[PDB]
Design a protein around this motif. Sequence first.
Motif, short mmCIF file in Angstrom:
data_model
loop_
_atom_site.label_atom_id
_atom_site.label_comp_id
_atom_site.label_asym_id
_atom_site.label_seq_id
_atom_site.Cartn_x
_atom_site.Cartn_y
_atom_site.Cartn_z
N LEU A 71 11.68 43.53 40.33
CA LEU A 71 10.92 44.46 39.82
C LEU A 71 10.79 44.29 38.33
N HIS A 72 10.15 43.94 37.24
CA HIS A 72 10.65 44.26 35.97
C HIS A 72 9.70 45.13 35.04
N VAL A 73 10.62 46.16 34.57
CA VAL A 73 10.25 46.90 34.01
C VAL A 73 10.51 46.69 32.31
N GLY A 118 13.02 42.36 20.56
CA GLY A 118 12.47 43.62 20.57
C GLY A 118 11.81 44.02 21.73
N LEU A 119 12.32 43.86 22.51
CA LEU A 119 12.06 43.69 24.39
C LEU A 119 13.48 44.92 24.53
N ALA A 120 13.17 45.07 26.23
CA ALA A 120 13.93 45.76 26.84
C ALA A 120 13.47 45.52 28.41
N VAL A 147 4.92 47.49 34.31
CA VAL A 147 5.63 46.82 35.82
C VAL A 147 5.01 46.27 36.34
N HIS A 148 6.14 44.89 36.05
CA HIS A 148 5.27 44.17 37.68
C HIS A 148 6.23 43.09 37.83
N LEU A 149 6.47 42.74 39.80
CA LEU A 149 7.39 41.86 40.56
C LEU A 149 6.70 40.70 40.70
N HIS A 150 8.25 39.90 40.64
CA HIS A 150 8.02 38.22 41.30
C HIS A 150 8.93 38.78 43.46
N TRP A 151 8.06 37.61 43.31
CA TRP A 151 8.09 37.81 45.33
C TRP A 151 8.27 35.53 45.62
N1 LIG Z 1 8.91 38.39 33.77
S1 LIG Z 1 9.34 39.95 32.04
O1 LIG Z 1 9.38 40.49 32.52
O2 LIG Z 1 10.46 38.21 31.14
C1 LIG Z 1 7.33 39.90 31.17
C2 LIG Z 1 6.72 39.20 31.44
C3 LIG Z 1 5.31 39.09 30.91
C4 LIG Z 1 5.01 39.67 29.38
C5 LIG Z 1 4.33 39.98 29.09
O3 LIG Z 1 3.72 40.78 28.37
C6 LIG Z 1 3.17 38.69 28.70
N2 LIG Z 1 2.30 39.04 27.87
C7 LIG Z 1 0.23 39.75 27.91
N3 LIG Z 1 0.12 39.71 26.16
C8 LIG Z 1 1.14 39.64 25.49
C9 LIG Z 1 1.11 38.85 24.59
C10 LIG Z 1 2.45 38.24 23.42
C11 LIG Z 1 3.45 38.46 24.19
C12 LIG Z 1 3.87 38.60 25.44
C13 LIG Z 1 2.28 38.74 26.25
C14 LIG Z 1 6.63 40.27 28.94
C15 LIG Z 1 7.82 39.89 29.79
CL1 LIG Z 1 9.19 40.53 28.74
#
Ligand SMILES: NS(=O)(=O)c1ccc(C(=O)Cn2cnc3ccccc32)cc1Cl
Length: 258
Positions: A115-117, A137-139, A90-94
């Motif tokens: 917030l991004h989860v 791959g990702l959600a 989880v991280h945050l943007h501001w």
């Molecule tokens: N701001 S975002 O929420 O769209 C996001 C921001 C960062 C990451 C990461 O996991 C960054 N990261 C860190 N190590 C990684 C290895 C491969 C691919 C991405 C990698 C994933 C995502 Cl989905």
Amino acid sequence: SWGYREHNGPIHWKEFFPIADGDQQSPIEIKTKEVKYDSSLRPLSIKYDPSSAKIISNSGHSFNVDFDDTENKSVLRGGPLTGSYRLRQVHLHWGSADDHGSEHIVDGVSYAAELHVVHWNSDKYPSFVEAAHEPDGLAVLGVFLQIGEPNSQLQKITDTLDSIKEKGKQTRFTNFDLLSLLPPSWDYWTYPGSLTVPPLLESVTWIVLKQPINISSQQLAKFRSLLCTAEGEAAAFLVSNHRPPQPLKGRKVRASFH
Ligand SMILES: NS(=O)(=O)c1ccc(C(=O)Cn2cnc3ccccc32)cc1Cl
Ligand SMILES: [Zn+2]
């Protein structure tokens, strides 16, 4: 390397990660009159174990709370997704002002933060790193923050920030009840897109909740005191870390609700 300062910020990322100008980039403007209600979308099915959170760290680009993603204790299902997506971080943007901090923008409204989860498809892929390079791959669940009453779960994060002020610092962090942090309504918009940070991979199913959660102005402000620089180096502060909205390029944004 990349960041959010003048020379290395979002406008320059395309110079060195060409997919910055791709067809499925995030974030976007969400125009509620253009979104398509889709009766095939499912309610979100959310399971988050507070013991999953283990570490909080300063990446130089945000904080990240890392979750032990060894097995399927914390997973996201339903919504637009096929299969089970395991919680990773989880991280945050501001922004530098409460007026404008989110990444997604809703009919012109930028929220104070977002917030991004981040989850990955463990039903198809063996690891986050493999998942991160595939369209399915990702959600990512995005949750807007607006200024209001202090948030008691977020206070746990702000209480750690003094220990992770420098880029690369980490500290332990657990018992974080992410499920209870989410807003009362889980109605959402969804579209295919990308990471909003380099490497900007087009591997994300975005699920953006309509209803914001609250944070106080003082709690939000503590995040701007993180440094984007490492220990013993010219200090610069991460006062803002959001990427501007990117062209929709004919993607369909769908609503789970009407
Ligand atoms: N701001 S975002 O929420 O769209 C996001 C921001 C960062 C990451 C990461 O996991 C960054 N990261 C860190 N190590 C990684 C290895 C491969 C691919 C991405 C990698 C994933 C995502 Cl989905
Ligand atoms: Zn993010």
